[PDB]
């Protein structure tokens, strides 16, 4: 019928994709952490900070096949596209039967007294069977478990102060009914079954939140283009828009800017330290003016 | 202002930004987080229109 109708919407599409990452050519020391001479006892796990590097995770697949590689807050295959603010590697060796406890929300001897993950956990749990390196016919000192604790552990709370069990109803120093050596050692032989053989575990905790980041995946930078509708990725922050010179006076501390409705409207370029405004690409509704198809097929 | 402000809410999702959900997760998980955002944003539009 004759009239004006609203049909679909129009959008200006981007013409190119611009990705900007900092001047970092240093590789992350994942091989030093995974290819350890020795792994820390689970009761006293070794936390290694990873910073100022490219988190190229292909080296992890080069290191070993894996028993378990389960990511909770991220995809295991998109880790090289992401950029992380703070990455920590918790390295320890545990009994295979306890591997299922290295997960958010779990309980058991390890989740309760040696190493606990928070419920709000973003990261990856990586494990492999290390029997050929850690088991010995005479036993070893790699396995230590804090069987008894006055209270359960909080996530990432390390406590290596050992005294004596308070299992009984009387204070004592080693009395067998009421007191046991606070930290137990266990000996393992290469002939033990799959559930008793040692496994090497590395937990990668990723604070994948907010503006700062020291470690970005292996992306290749491109040139900047201003005053055009483009796709972009700034240190993991992605979107579509027009990048223009900004007149906002950001403090050296401030890195991103936001509007009154908490949307991103400015970024700092990781190499130039230029502040760029983000303008959305033009969009709007499309209306069609029709004389009516019983008169003419011309439309505006 | 309220309708726009609602876009920053998570509605139980891991993140309020849709591009970050797609950037971080594989489709099977992204669909769950996205459905949470769709439910919240659609409910916000119906409230606005009513």
């Amino acid at each position: 019928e004759k009239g004006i109708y609203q049909t679909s919407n129009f959008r200006v599409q981007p013409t190119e994709s611009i990705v900007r990452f900092p001047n970092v050519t240093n590789l992350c020391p994942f091989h030093e952490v995974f290819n350890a001479t020795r792994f820390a006892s689970v009761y006293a796990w070794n936390r290694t900070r990873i910073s100022n590097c490219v988190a190229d995770y292909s080296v992890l697949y080069n290191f070993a096949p894996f028993f378990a590689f389960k990511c909770y807050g991220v995809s295991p295959t998109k880790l090289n596209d992401l950029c992380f603010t703070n990455v920590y590697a918790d390295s320890f060796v545990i009994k295979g039967n306890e591997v299922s406890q290295i997960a958010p929300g779990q309980t058991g001897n390890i989740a309760d007294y040696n190493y606990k993950l928070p419920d709000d956990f973003t990261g990856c749990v990586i494990a492999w069977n290390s029997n050929k390196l850690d088991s010995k016919h005479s036993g070893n000192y790699d396995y230590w478990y804090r069987s008894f604790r006055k209270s359960k552990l909080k996530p990432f709370e390390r406590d290596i102060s050992t005294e004596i069990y308070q299992a009984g109803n009387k204070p004592c120093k080693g009395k067998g009914p009421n007191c046991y050596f606070p930290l137990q050692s266990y000996g393992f032989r290469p002939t033990y079954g799959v559930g008793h053989q040692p496994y090497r575990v590395v937990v990668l905790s990723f604070e994948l939140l907010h503006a700062p980041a020291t470690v970005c995946g292996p992306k290749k930078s491109t040139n900047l283009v201003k005053n055009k509708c483009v796709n972009f990725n700034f240190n993991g922050l992605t979107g579509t828009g027009v990048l223009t010179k900004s007149n906002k006076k950001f403090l050296p501390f401030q890195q991103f800017g936001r509007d009154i409705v908490d949307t991103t409207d400015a970024v700092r370029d990781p190499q130039t330290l230029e502040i760029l405004d983000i303008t959305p690409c033009s969009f709007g509704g499309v209306s069609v003016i029709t004389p009516g198809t019983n008169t003419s097929n011309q439309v505006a | 202002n309220t309708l726009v402000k609602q876009l920053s809410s998570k509605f139980g999702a891991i993140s309020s930004v849709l591009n970050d959900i797609l950037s971080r997760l594989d489709p099977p998980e992204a669909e769950v987080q996205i459905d949470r955002l769709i439910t919240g944003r659609l409910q916000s539009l119906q409230t606005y229109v009513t």
């Binding site: 009154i260 409705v261 959305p280 969009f283 709007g284 | 309708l3 726009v4 876009l7």
Partner: peptide, 29 residues
């Protein structure tokens, strides 16, 4: 003598109460 040809009172009424708005332009027009 004034643009818009409004009366003095209409001009006052128009001045007391307060076309692309960048704010809120997230699909809402």
């Amino acid at each position: 003598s004034k643009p818009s040809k409004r009366s003095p009172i209409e001009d006052l009424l128009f001045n007391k109460v307060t076309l692309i708005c960048a704010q809120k332009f997230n699909g809402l027009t």
